Amino acid sequence: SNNYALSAQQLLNASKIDDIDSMMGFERYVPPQYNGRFDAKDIDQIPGRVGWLTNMHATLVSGISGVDFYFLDEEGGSFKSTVVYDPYFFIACNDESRVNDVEELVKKYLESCLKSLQIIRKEDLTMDNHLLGLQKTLIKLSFVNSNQLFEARKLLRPILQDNANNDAKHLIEDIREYDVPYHVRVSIDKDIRVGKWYKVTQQGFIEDTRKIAFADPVVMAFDIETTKPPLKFPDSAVDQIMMISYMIDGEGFLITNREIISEDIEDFEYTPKPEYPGFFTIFNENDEVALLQRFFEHIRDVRPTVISTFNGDFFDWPFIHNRSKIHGLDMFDEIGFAPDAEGEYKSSYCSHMDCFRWVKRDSYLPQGSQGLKAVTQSKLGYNPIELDPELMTPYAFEKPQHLSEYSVSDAVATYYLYMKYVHPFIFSLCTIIPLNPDETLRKGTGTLCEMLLMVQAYQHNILLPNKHTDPIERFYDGHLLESETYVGGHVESLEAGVFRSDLKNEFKIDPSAIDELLQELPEALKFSVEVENKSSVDKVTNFEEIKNQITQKLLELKENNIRNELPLIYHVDVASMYPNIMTTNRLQPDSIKAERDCASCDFNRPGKTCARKLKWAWRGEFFPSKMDEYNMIKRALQNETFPNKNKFSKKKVLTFDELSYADQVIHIKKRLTEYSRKVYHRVKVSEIVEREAIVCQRENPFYVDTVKSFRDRRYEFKGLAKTWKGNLSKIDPSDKHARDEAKKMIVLYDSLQLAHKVILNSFYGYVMRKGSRWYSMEMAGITCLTGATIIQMARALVERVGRPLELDTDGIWCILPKSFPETYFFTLENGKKLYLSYPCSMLNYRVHQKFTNHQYQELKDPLNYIYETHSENTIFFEVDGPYKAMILPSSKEEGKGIKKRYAVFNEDGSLAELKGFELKRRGELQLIKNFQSDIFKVFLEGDTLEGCYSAVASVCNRWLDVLDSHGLMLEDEDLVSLICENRSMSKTLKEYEGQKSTSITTARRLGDFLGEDMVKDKGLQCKYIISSKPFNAPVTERAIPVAIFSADIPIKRSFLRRWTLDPSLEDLDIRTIIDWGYYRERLGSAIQKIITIPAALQGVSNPVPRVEHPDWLKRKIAT
DNA sequence: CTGTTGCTGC
DNA sequence: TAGCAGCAACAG
């Protein structure tokens, strides 16, 4: 009864969606009957209608499961069409001789929900000898809809649990493919993809290629301005919407609520650049309900198939929907928008493109630059208008024109952020990923890898693995593992200092490294022609000229091996390092074989070449307790009694063995933490064990073929990109002469390039995606250890011919002598020039001689299972630079460097890279950010090293004066701003219980002072100052929310008194509250790491005497 | 000395 | 629902 009721409820929701879709122009098109011969070559005679699939969703049709497909379509404004398809999954059998006994059992056991059954065959890469065409026999179960499929899973799961813990029932091994989403199933099984064009026909969807450009959907982008209380956040229960700003296809609009906005706003232009027009037409509406009705009316009129917002999943749409509910409007019946199971806002016809999702995932912006202004500055390259949130509600009455200018600025910023970056990126991803735009924007990158691998496995008739479930506990040497992993990317900080293209450095070249390079030179130059440039040496007219020029420079560096000359500042980095290690070594999770599976394989003979053995470094963190002590703790817990977690059970108490195995292990881990601390005084030993695994080269190539093929398609688009770049400049300059179609397609191929790029680097990660399928914790360890070995080999050469400064995973930063052999050009007989970078090609040659896979096997004849063996290697360094300067900081500790922080400057004086520093990080003490933001460029001043340290000393002394002067030389608003430290709490304050930190204390005090609403959401920005005047107290106990300094005087007083424990305090000036010694020590630290200690290591005497060296360093300097 | 956590690395 | 290595503040 409940399943019919649920199917009727789903049909009633599907009818409401059909009514809404028809209101928005998405009438359900059914194609004409065509009894002719189906050939996709004669598509124009083929019947029905061609369209580009813009939006797809799972539906229930008169219920039968189907997918509705929404076609921005060519020509048309839009039309939907439906594909019906039976939901299915598989049963696996342990004995293939008795499949018919299992078939009869499941027909009779699933009769209440099963539509049909069929025996099929699939390749299973875990089956012994599948590489001979042996396929696993499977029972396909098909259903009328997804609800009946879910009931069959509820009936089968008890049999699998009985079989695993304790007759044709015991022949059921597992259920396979039971957890594929239904729209993803239809998209894979029919090869239909959003962003791709299709002709909708009776037989299904036929992809079209004569059309690579996207259609132009109607794109709306909006933002909302709300009332708020002072120092608090707008509450949709009490606060009103003041204005809604939006853009539609490049026209601007503003709706204003005249209960709140004091004047009628006139039509105006906000064009922040000539490439971002914004003409705003104004709707001055009488009240908040007229504002909401106008907004819903205008959405129905223009029929947007995309609505974009900035963070509107979590502010804008929640606010509009709650205000609509207060006024008795149903936003779902008005415009088709509702919150989903995640609380994100979605419709059928229109995709919701929250730009903040792309900003968080894909923009590559650090979390400190992920707010709208900093995204606009970093992507659109202008400053939007900026208003203080505390001035918004006053300015609705005092200056509403300046509030409307701010609101239209955030609509313009959101619209052009969407159209220049999010739109081309997401629809390009949809052309390859079996997901709609909303899922393609919002799912994690490792889920996008899962979908691509599921397409490729399906196309090769491979059986999908079930999702990996982490074991609840594991043991190593009788110790309970807290966690296991591998040794990841290798990282070194070798030197610290300022390095400049115009300042001299000492070099001590190893003459034996130059002898190796002179002996390798002929084959390294041949390798650069044949492998890097894919040409033949016979075509190169000047090969011996370039060889002799490099030979002379090398001989001069061998004879004069101790030099003091200018540097060349270079970065050498491995192109797509982990993907290229994976393709080179044929690394997948489809091959890592045990000695058993390798022994069971008919290709395992004397002389076998196909078993490539590779090393990895496993890392345990396990409890110091042994298996006897674990068993003693388990026996102790078996005598205890536990509360029943299931509120629906009348049984309030359970024994240990009546708990779930996950709950048993949670209780074991708790008592083991106490026992380990009591007996061993310490908690998590860590150990690194080098392990070996067997990489099959003969195993079915579907994973690696996806990677090779994807890599080549990306290279393809980089090439096409370059050809298009030539096309965009070769031609005439009449910009409007039907060549703006050519430039959008340039953005498009760039976007498909960036798309394959993210997909590849993701495959590289996905493979450690806990809970994902095709997981391969090993494979990941081999990839990292192979990479660590490559980069240490490269460093060990660069250290012998120059000085490596920093090493991070795939990249080495180094200085070479300015006399070093650098860039050259080979001349072909056809007058074309090939590029040579000798510092790059000398590394690439050594990578190819040491890391090539001479065991790579590929299947030449699929009928006879004949494999060819060849030599594969795709691991190349690229070179970036040279540079004008590089500045590396040093640690406060003796003999230690700082990794992952540096600044680099281009020849033109501009900043090329800034890594890691507080300036870039979200949050952080603002004084430190403003400091770093002053100092780095000042390293380009002076003519000597000492003059350069002097110029930066002076900036240090300016900043030290501000703190020694206790800020007096500073405006009071500017002071609060500078001394503020801002830190995000990733959760809510409740979830931090028994922890301490400045954020926690700031949040608690904000709560007490401004109310519990302040801390109910996650992501709270805790802005605080550290207190103290002539005394002292605990750090995390001394964070004061800077907001208190804007409270009414009696409030401020009561709280600062509490927080400082001073009943009788009268002085409420921030300046007497602040702990100046704390801030001088934080700034001192920065000055040490970036300026004084590195100065010392370059033998320059303390350029900032007001900051004293630590003792070890003072001591260092005695002779 | 370790261990926790935020935001970066690359 | 991608991974590991690292800086550094603050507690113990």
Ligand code: SF4
């Ligand atoms: S190494 Fe050869 S014999 Fe062993 S599992 Fe792989 S393909 Fe089969």
